[PDB]
Structure 1
Amino acid sequence: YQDKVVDVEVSLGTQPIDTVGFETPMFLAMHGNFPERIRFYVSTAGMVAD
């Protein structure tokens, strides 16, 4: 038995996937300015704010 005169399936093969990036460096300094373990900055003006 069937319940539809017309039936259509649609499947999406466009799933994005996580990737690694070989750009961002890290510097492991000594301080107590912020509680978390890592902070990202785009300019020194941001660092001076913290």
Structure 2
Amino acid sequence: MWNPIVNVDITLNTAGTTREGFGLPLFLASTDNFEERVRGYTSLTEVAEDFDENTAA
């Protein structure tokens, strides 16, 4: 499909950098919001979609 020669997007949020190390955490929660027994997330926003604010996860 047609694309602008230059595409620019700007938002008023705030962001920080990540860093890589040894080992990633896992949280063993009691929930049923999804079928698979393990699922990954890369920001609090994604967690908020499948979990509300009062959930332990």
Q: Give the TM-score taking structure 1 as reference length.
A: 0.52
- Give runs of ≥4 in structure 1 deviating > 3 Å: none
* Cross-structure match for 1:5: none
Question: Bigger radius of gyration, 1 or 2?
Answer: 1
Residues matched between the structures, number: 30
CA-based RMSD = 1.5
- Alpha-carbon distance in structure 1 between the residues aligned to 2:23 and 2:42: 13
In structure 2, runs of 5+ residues without a counterpart are 1-20, 51-57
* Cross-structure match for 1:46: 46
- Alpha-carbon distance in structure 2 between the residues aligned to 1:25 and 1:46: 16
Aligned-pair distance for 1:38?
A: 0.2
> Which is strand-richer, 1 or 2?
2
Percentage of pairs with the same residue = 47
- Alpha-carbon distance in structure 2 between the residues aligned to 1:48 and 1:29: 15
* Cross-structure match for 1:34: 34
More relative contact order, 1 or 2 (CA 8 Å, 6+ apart): 2
- Alpha-carbon distance in structure 2 between the residues aligned to 1:43 and 1:31: 19
Q: Give the TM-score taking structure 2 as reference length.
A: 0.46
